[PDB]
Design a binder for this molecule. Sequence first.
Ligand SMILES: CO[C@@H]1O[C@H](CS[C@]2(C(=O)O)C[C@H](O)[C@@H](NC(C)=O)[C@H]([C@H](O)[C@H](O)CO)O2)[C@H](O)[C@H](O)[C@H]1O
Ligand SMILES: CC(=O)N[C@H]1[C@H]([C@H](O)[C@H](O)CO)O[C@@](O)(C(=O)O)C[C@@H]1O
Ligand SMILES: CC(=O)N[C@H]1[C@H]([C@H](O)[C@H](O)CO)OC(C(=O)O)=C[C@@H]1O
Ligand SMILES: CC(=O)N[C@H]1[C@H]([C@H](O)[C@H](O)CO)OC(C(=O)O)=C[C@@H]1O
Ligand SMILES: CC(=O)N[C@@H]1[C@@H](O)[C@H](O)[C@@H](CO)O[C@@H]1O
Ligand SMILES: CC(=O)N[C@@H]1[C@@H](O)[C@H](O)[C@@H](CO)O[C@@H]1O
Ligand SMILES: [Ca+2]
Ligand SMILES: [Ca+2]
Lengths: 446, 447
Amino acid sequence: GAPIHDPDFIGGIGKELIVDNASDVTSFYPSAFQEHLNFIPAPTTGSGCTRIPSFDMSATHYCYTHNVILSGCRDHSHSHQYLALGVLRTTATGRIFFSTLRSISLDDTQNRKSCSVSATPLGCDMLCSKVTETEEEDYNSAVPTLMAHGRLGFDGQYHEKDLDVTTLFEDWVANYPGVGGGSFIDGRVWFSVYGGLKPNSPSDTVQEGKYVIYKRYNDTCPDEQDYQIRMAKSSYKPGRFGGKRIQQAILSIKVSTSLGEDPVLTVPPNTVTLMGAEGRILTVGTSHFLYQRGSSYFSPALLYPMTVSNKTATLHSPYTFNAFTRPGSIPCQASARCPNSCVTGVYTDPYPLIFYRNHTLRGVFGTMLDSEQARLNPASAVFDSTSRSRITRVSSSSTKAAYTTSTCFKVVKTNKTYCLSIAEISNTLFGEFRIVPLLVEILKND
Amino acid sequence: GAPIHDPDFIGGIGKELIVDNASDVTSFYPSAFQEHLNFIPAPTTGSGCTRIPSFDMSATHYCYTHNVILSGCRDHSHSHQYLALGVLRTTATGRIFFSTLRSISLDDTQNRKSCSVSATPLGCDMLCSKVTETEEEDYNSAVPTLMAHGRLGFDGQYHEKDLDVTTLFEDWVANYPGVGGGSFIDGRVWFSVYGGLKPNSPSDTVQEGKYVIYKRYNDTCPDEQDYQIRMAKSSYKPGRFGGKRIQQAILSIKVSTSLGEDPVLTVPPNTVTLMGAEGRILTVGTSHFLYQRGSSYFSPALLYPMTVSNKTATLHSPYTFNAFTRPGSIPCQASARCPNSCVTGVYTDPYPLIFYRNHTLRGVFGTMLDSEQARLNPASAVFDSTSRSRITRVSSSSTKAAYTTSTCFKVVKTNKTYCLSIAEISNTLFGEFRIVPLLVEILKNDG
Ligand SMILES: CO[C@@H]1O[C@H](CS[C@]2(C(=O)O)C[C@H](O)[C@@H](NC(C)=O)[C@H]([C@H](O)[C@H](O)CO)O2)[C@H](O)[C@H](O)[C@H]1O
Ligand SMILES: CC(=O)N[C@H]1[C@H]([C@H](O)[C@H](O)CO)O[C@@](O)(C(=O)O)C[C@@H]1O
Ligand SMILES: CC(=O)N[C@H]1[C@H]([C@H](O)[C@H](O)CO)OC(C(=O)O)=C[C@@H]1O
Ligand SMILES: CC(=O)N[C@H]1[C@H]([C@H](O)[C@H](O)CO)OC(C(=O)O)=C[C@@H]1O
Ligand SMILES: CC(=O)N[C@@H]1[C@@H](O)[C@H](O)[C@@H](CO)O[C@@H]1O
Ligand SMILES: CC(=O)N[C@@H]1[C@@H](O)[C@H](O)[C@@H](CO)O[C@@H]1O
Ligand SMILES: [Ca+2]
Ligand SMILES: [Ca+2]
């Protein structure tokens, strides 16, 4: 009885979209942006701050959420979340439109932040942190960040349960969802999570001495090997948050009428993962991936293959897309090639788009910020390990922007492949930002 | 079970909101704009044109729609409509939000234009014209404009039936819905319509020689009496559309599973109505009103009292709000005071807000374009027959805008009055316009 996408999409959601072994990845490219039903609310006042979009779509419905601050993006006192659950549909003319069925403003007195959502068989699951301090202050206070698992049901009602962070995140000083969407796998919902570890705690100790260096395709770091290792190690304890170890983690929760049931946190070894950061758990076909924002020295987009075993997950050496860089402050700018300590960058995920016949990933779609340091010029394109296809731009003029989260699918009825790319774009008259659901069709030269 | 607004709204939709006789209407004014769930889709491309908003809300649900053109606002080849049916709700903190339940893009082989919506017990009824020519070309072709009565049901399905315009609008050369919302009254849905009459037809001949002159509060027109009457008569047949008589009308349709059932057209005498124009049918309390856009020489916002008798309607001398002017090209600019012939102005309606104890309307809320000739600088405020309260501005800087349609309501629990004001505002990067649902609370000078 639950909602489902129109018949035109059945079988075209969350699967390997393009399988070719001959064609060059970059022979595929995005069309000009397309006009479709903008399902994302824009601000209604001059100061309203709408930011931090999260989106996930299963074979039956999609979920979306973003944060809203009344006075501006700088205010940290209180805020509310917009939540939407809907399904994909097509017009009589074959035009797609995300048709939301449940649209609500979640505003009590709790300050939910850095929320991630995931489409599960019971509706739209959301994981958020509840803050009573600034991020800097959070990392400075020994106790972990409070968190809650909530869900917007098909009936439009929202229910949630606060997680026992004192136990679940006993070894952490701060912990937040990765904002990127979560994914439903084997009866459990999986969320990317990150934060700071309590020094000398068991979690901190096991990571002691663990690091991993990922390099730029055709740009070797000149520094002596011993120095790179030194910097690689320190990259996990950047100065931004008082030298606390910023760790990557994955949280899985059983999906049931009981929210927060049987939570299990997985902390991958830092011999594979770079400094903890925002991220997303993706499922395309039978493959799973952890996207990790390039908040550290590594600029190319990362996708760590992810396999699940019961309630825990295992990550492997990541796929990297050298041309899919992100802006960052020096010495961690887009063109950075050496290990260093920093907490910068921006969330701009890559969606698995092209695969080999044997299911290894070849190319992805994404909207990068085509800039060295400043958060500017959104550019949608198709990427492989080293290059970028022809691009599609929001504007030929200098344009301020931030986060982008892309999800691709296929309209089986028209046999056309599309990619939704939700991007925070600068705005005028109504708030600092406008979260726009950009849409493009994936094309191929000839 | 059909959808319904949250309990906090029961008894706060479509009623006289403020009944006062001892206070000055302008002592009531709008608060600063409030941040709330923006239920109106903005463009997603640089050329996308989202325009022509229509909105209506009943005691159970609200309805909204707007037109979308892919290449820009000047392209008339094809387009589609965005349609939404939803209900009002409140957050845990008591914040209000319009929660849409059915959200669709309606795009087929037909080009629906100038559409109006109305919340009926069966869903969201829509009246549109289906065009295959420019407005100019339409008035030149003798046959009437094709029209259709559609409906977005609670189940999210859209159905429609073309009206037999050859018979229904036999005397017309062009006919469109007034874009403003329609209203459900006594088992029927009522829509404002306007267009041009076929010269010398029965409808045309009966209106020949008929006219009415409405004046500005103080500003008396200096022109000679006989000259004014001549200008007034001519205002009904402006040159823009070749001397055709632009006529105002009201269409009622029976609300049932059968769309377009028993349509009846009412053409009011031009001894009461000014040149035909876009409009809206409003129902507040037991009173009904026809808002008529000031497309002719009259600038002040207009609300004609409307009484219904079975399937037909009767209009009466209108309420006028002298300070609620609208921009227009000379000699029909905001400060115009004399009868004249023109087709200008813009749609910016007034919502009945304050009533006298005996139910006579005293004040309204609306968002005017505070400019003489250019469509600029939106200003939300409360108006009485002669003045305007303090205002709330979209921006202190010069701002391009267009249509505005307002609807007010109340949260009986907190006894707080709110006004939604949907306004077409200029945009950057994504299309020429952004239709924004502005929201204010109605406050009072001294309490
Ligand atoms: C220009 O100084 C600011 O003026 C503000 C006035 S209140 C208000 C207005 O003009 O009415 C409230 C409006 O809702 C608001 N508009 C929107 C869209 O949010 C409007 C604009 O913010 C203002 O006009 C700038 O364009 O302001 C208020 O006193 C501020 O505190 C002043 O700094
Ligand atoms: C928002 C938008 O529609 N962007 C479009 C842009 C802009 O119109 C121009 O860059 C002018 O700024 O033009 C494109 O050809 C491009 O650059 O990729 C297609 C793209 O869809
Ligand atoms: C929990 C929190 O504050 N998240 C913020 C995130 C964070 O600072 C980064 O992941 C480094 O920790 O950065 C930004 C941002 O535009 O970059 C916005 C998020 O609000
Ligand atoms: C049917 C039609 O074309 N409607 C148009 C309307 C019309 O020109 C006017 O009501 C004169 O009749 O004006 C305008 C306008 O922004 O002013 C936009 C509408 O799209
Ligand atoms: C799972 C598997 O067989 N992977 C291989 C990959 O190693 C190889 O590089 C590619 C061709 O070059 O084919 C497949 O993708
Ligand atoms: C129909 C009717 O009785 N209207 C009267 C109106 O004439 C008068 O100006 C006002 C103020 O007392 O009260 C009512 O509105
Ligand atoms: Ca803490
Ligand atoms: Ca015609």
